């Protein structure tokens, strides 16, 4: 690894500078280097890792959707043949995206998940595993599509099981996990009713627990609860 010679603390410091400069590819490389030092990540460090890769893959996914839409239009009746270039370039972006997902999944497997024993870390990493398998599922079209989808489902389901046992219903990790698993049901697993049920139950159970929270925790939880409500409004 190109970060093998840099101190763990320096990698973390530079990840924070990269975030301020909106240099998310650098931020991800610094955080990958920090993970590869082999020590567990603190809560703040886990969130630096997730912010970095979410921004990198988010740009790739948005670009992939633009190119996919152009490719789809090219294959409609009446569309002039323009050659292989659109497919080739969509494939190039797709391969890069898959590489980033494989990198994240590799960090989780070697060895973040196996060392994560507290609920906040374990649920966080399993949510990430579900998310990055879900991004692979967004572009999958072949023999492995069902297994990719099931890998996302299985990771999310383990995270849900732990979060229900070990976290309050207002915990922001639990809420974001539920938000994303609901989206998985809606748009990956062809299960809109499950998506709506999960979002509604998650919202209602969080509502009932807000009275236990400080003002700052209340703000954290209600922010994600509003995202659940936004999705429910879109879907109903």
């Amino acid at each position: 690894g190109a970060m093998g010679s840099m101190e763990r603390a320096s990698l973390i410091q530079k990840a924070k500078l990269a975030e301020q400069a909106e240099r998310y590819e650098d931020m991800a490389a610094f955080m990958k280097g920090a993970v590869e030092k082999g020590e567990e990540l603190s809560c703040e460090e886990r969130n630096l890792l997730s912010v970095a890769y979410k921004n990198v893959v988010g740009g790739q996914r948005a670009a992939w959707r633009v190119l996919s839409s152009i490719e789809q239009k090219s294959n409609e009746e009446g569309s002039e043949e323009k050659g292989p270039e659109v497919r080739e370039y969509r494939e190039k972006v797709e391969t890069e995206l898959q590489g980033v997902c494989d990198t994240v999944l590799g960090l989780l497997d070697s060895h973040l998940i196996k060392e994560a024993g507290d609920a906040e870390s374990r649920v966080f990493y399993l949510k990430m595993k579900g998310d990055y398998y879900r991004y692979l599922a967004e572009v999958a079209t072949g023999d492995d599509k069902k297994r990719i989808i099931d890998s996302a489902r299985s990771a999310y389901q383990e995270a849900m099981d732990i979060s229900k046992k070990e976290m309050p219903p207002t915990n922001p990790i639990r809420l974001g996990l539920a938000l994303n698993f609901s989206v998985f049901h809606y748009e990956i697993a062809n299960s809109p009713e499950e998506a709506i049920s999960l979002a509604k139950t998650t919202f209602d159970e969080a509502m009932a627990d807000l009275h236990t929270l400080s003002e700052d925790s209340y703000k954290d939880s209600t922010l994600i609860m509003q995202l659940l409500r936004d999705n429910l409004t879109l879907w109903t």
């Binding site: 998310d131 938000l179 989206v183 748009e187 994600i224 995202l227 936004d230 999705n231 879907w235």
Partner: peptide, 6 residues
Amino acid sequence: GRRATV
């Protein structure tokens, strides 16, 4: 709007 994930 696009559905939300976090």
